C-alpha cells in the first residue's frame, strides 16, 4: 504494498502535473527495490508508470536520457522474471520514435514469441490490456496500433463475423466498440481528452456501421467484483465491499482533501464491528486489497419543495444537499451509511452512487410507509418538475433513473414477486418512461411503460372486483401524456424492424402516425405530400 | 435534367408541383425563383398569379388571364365590384381575341379557352349573387346549377375540369371567410363540403390521390367529427383505399360501421343511405382482398345493407333506389 502504491501514484501525479530529476530518481529507486525484494510488487501497478513517461521523450535531454534509461532497465533487466513475463508481454507498443529500436525489438520478441498475431489476436490483446488498465490516456499508442491493424487487415473482418453469425450476442467487433465507448466515457472528464477522443473516434472511423444483428448493449464487468458480490450473502457485506472498493479507487487521486477524507473513512469503517466481520468473510479471497487495507486495522428536515429541485445549473449542490439532508436525519442506521458524510461532501460522484443505497437503507427501516409515502410524493414531484415544458440538466435525470433502476432490483422484505419489487415506491412509471425517452434510454422507458400499463390493468381489475386506445386516452386525461404516442416514439427510435404497427402503425388516422409510418416504409413520395398538406 | 432551357423547365416544374398537390412548397420555390432571378417573363409571371389566387396568397401584389382572375378575386374580397367587372370583361376580351387570332383547325385547342370562359362566367354569377346579400334559396340554386353543369362535364378531361373545381373551392372559401355568424354559414359550409367531396370523386376517377387528400384536409379543417359520422368519413376511407392504404381504409370504415350501428336511431335517411353505402363498400373490399371467408362477411355486410335499404323504402326516392340497386 500500500505504501509503495501510494508513493508511486503521488510521484506520477507530480510528474503529470507539469525536481523532476529527483522524482525520477525516487521512482527508479522504489521500482528497483520492488523488483529486488519482491517478484509481484510491480505485477499490477506498473502499466501506468510504463505508459506515462513515453510522451516525455520530447523534452529536455536529461529527461529523455532518464526516460530511455528507465525503459531499457524495465524491458531488459526485468524481462527474465517469470511473474513479470506476463506484464511485459501485455503492454502498449511504442511506435513513437526511431530511437526506440531496441525497445521495439525487445517488445516484439516476447510479443510474437509464438508467431505473428492475426487481427483477431490483436483484438483480443487490445481488449485484455483495455480491461487490465483503467487509464485511457496511457492507451493512446494501443489505439494507434489498433487503428493500423484494422486499416491494414480489413480483409480479416469478413470471416470473423462469418464465424460469429452463430453467436451474434458475443460479437468481437461489437465488444471492441462498446469497450472503446466505455474508455471514452472514462476519459470524458480527464486531462488530455482531445487526443484520446480523437484516437477512439478514428478507431471507430476505420470501421463502418456494420449491422451486428444485435440491439442490446452489454457492459462488461471485471469477474472479481462479480464473484465477490456473488459470494457475499449479506446486503451489509455487499454495501461494505462496494463502499470500501470505491474508497480505494478515490484514494489514489492527486487531490489531497479527497484522499485525507478517504483515509479517515477507511479507519472509520475498519474500526467498527462491521469492518471486522467484513474482514472475517473477506479473508479467504485472493485479492491484494487485503494487503492494501492491512495497515488500516426526522421528517421535518426533508419536506421542502425547493430542496428537491434547486436545479439551475446546480446539480452538484442539489446532490450534495440531498445526501447531507438524508444522512443528518434519523433514517440512516448503518455506521458505514452514517460516517461517509465528510468524504461525500467533497466528492461529486460519491453522492450520485450512494444516493440509491441510502434511500434503500432508510426505506428498509420504514414503518407504516411513513418514509415511503413522503419519498414517493417527492420523487413524483421531481419527475413532474422535469416534465414541465423545467429544462433540467440531463445529469439529474440520469441520476434519478439510476436510483430507480437500483431500487427496482431490491427485494421487498415482505413476501412478493418482481412486480411488487418494481413498486418499491408509490410511483406511476409513465412519467419516468417519458423521462427516459428524453434521456435516450429507450429500453428502460419501454419497460417502465409496460410496468405502468400492468399497474393500470391491475387497478382496473381490482376496482371491478382496456385496449391501447383506452389506456392512451386515460393517461392523456389523468397524467396528460399519451401512452400510445410514447410507445410509438420508443418503438421508432429503438430501430426494431416491425414494432410501430402494433401501436397503430398503418391503422391510425392521425397525421403524426401517418408521417411516422411513411418515413418508416421509406415512402418519401407520399411523405413529402403529407408534410406539405 | 438541366439541358432543358429554363424558359419551359421552370414551367414544367411548377405544373408538376401544382398537379402533385404541393402548394406551400411551390410558393416557397417560386419565392426562391424571385430571389435568384429579378426580372419575370410573362409565362412565370402568369404562373405566379395562378398560384397566388389558387393558394389564396393575398399578400402578394396587358394583364394575363390569371392576373385578371386574381385581381377580380381581390376586388370581390374588398367589396369592389366596378374593378371586378372591368377585370372580368378585359379577361373575356383578351381570351376571345387570343383564341381567334390563331389558325384554329383543332377542336382540342378550344377546350382550354372554353374552360377559362366558364370559370369567368361562374365568377360573374358569384359576383351577382354576392352583390347585395346571400340567401339559402340562391345558394341552393347556384349549387344545383353547378352540379348539373358538372354532370354535363363528365366526359370532359380532368385537365380542363381542375381549374373550374379550384375556382369553385376558392369562391366557397371566400364566402365562408366573409360570412357573418348565422344559419347561412352552416348552409355555406355544407355546400363547401359537398363541393369538396364531388371534387374528391372527380379526382379519384382520374387516378389522382393528392387533390382528394387536400379536399379531405379542408373538410376536416372546417367540419368536425361527432357521434353521427357524415359521408366525408366514407369519402376519406375511399381516398385512403385509392392510396393503397387498405388497412387504414378498412379500419376507418369498420369504425364508421361500429358507430352507425350503435348510434343510428333512424335519425336521418341520409345517414341510412350512407350506412347502406358503407356496408356495401366494406363487403366489396372484404370480397376483393380476401382477409375473411365469404361466409361471415356476406351475412355481416351484404344482407345487412339489403335489409336496411329495404326496411325504410317508403319514400321511393332516386337517391334511395339507386343505392338499393347498387347493394
Ligand atoms: Zn424549462
Curated annotation (Swiss-Prot), chain A:
Outcome of mutating residue 366 to V: Might contribute to B-cell chronic lymphocytic leukemia
UniProt tissue specificity: Found in pancreas, kidney, skeletal muscle, liver, lung, placenta, brain, heart, spleen, thymus, testis, ovary, small intestine, colon and leukocytes.
Result, substituting residue 444 to R: In B-cell chronic lymphocytic leukemia
Consequence when changing residue 432 to L: Decreased phosphorylation of target proteins
UniProt modification remark: Phosphorylated by NUAK1/ARK5. During the late stages of DNA damage response, dephosphorylated following deacetylation by SIRT7, leading to ATM deactivation. Acetylated in vitro by KAT5/TIP60. Deacetylated by SIRT7 during the late stages of DNA damage response, promoting ATM dephosphorylation and subsequent deactivation.
Effect caused by changing residue 2 to S: Found in B-cell non-Hodgkin lymphoma; uncertain significance
Effect of residue 521 to K: Decreased phosphorylation of target proteins
Induction pattern: By ionizing radiation.
Source domain of life: Eukaryota
Function: Serine/threonine protein kinase which activates checkpoint signaling upon double strand breaks (DSBs), apoptosis and genotoxic stresses such as ionizing ultraviolet A light (UVA), thereby acting as a DNA damage sensor. Recognizes the substrate consensus sequence [ST]-Q. Phosphorylates 'Ser-139' of histone variant H2AX at double strand breaks (DSBs), thereby regulating DNA damage response mechanism.
Entry remark concerning the domains of this protein: The FATC domain is required for interaction with KAT5.
Subunit text: Homodimer. Dimers or tetramers in inactive state. On DNA damage, autophosphorylation dissociates ATM into monomers rendering them catalytically active. Binds p53/TP53, ABL1, BRCA1 and TERF1. Interacts with NBN (via FxF/Y motif). Part of the BRCA1-associated genome surveillance complex (BASC), which contains BRCA1, MSH2, MSH6, MLH1, ATM, BLM, PMS2 and the RAD50-MRE11-NBN protein complex. This association could be a dynamic process changing throughout the cell cycle and within subnuclear domains. Interacts with RAD17; DNA damage promotes the association.
Disease tied to this entry: Ataxia telangiectasia: A rare recessive disorder characterized by progressive cerebellar ataxia, dilation of the blood vessels in the conjunctiva and eyeballs, immunodeficiency, growth retardation and sexual immaturity. Patients have a strong predisposition to cancer; about 30% of patients develop tumors, particularly lymphomas and leukemias. Cells from affected individuals are highly sensitive to damage by ionizing radiation and resistant to inhibition of DNA synthesis following irradiation.
Name of the molecule in the record: Serine-protein kinase ATM
Lineage of source species: Eukaryota, Metazoa, Chordata, Craniata, Vertebrata
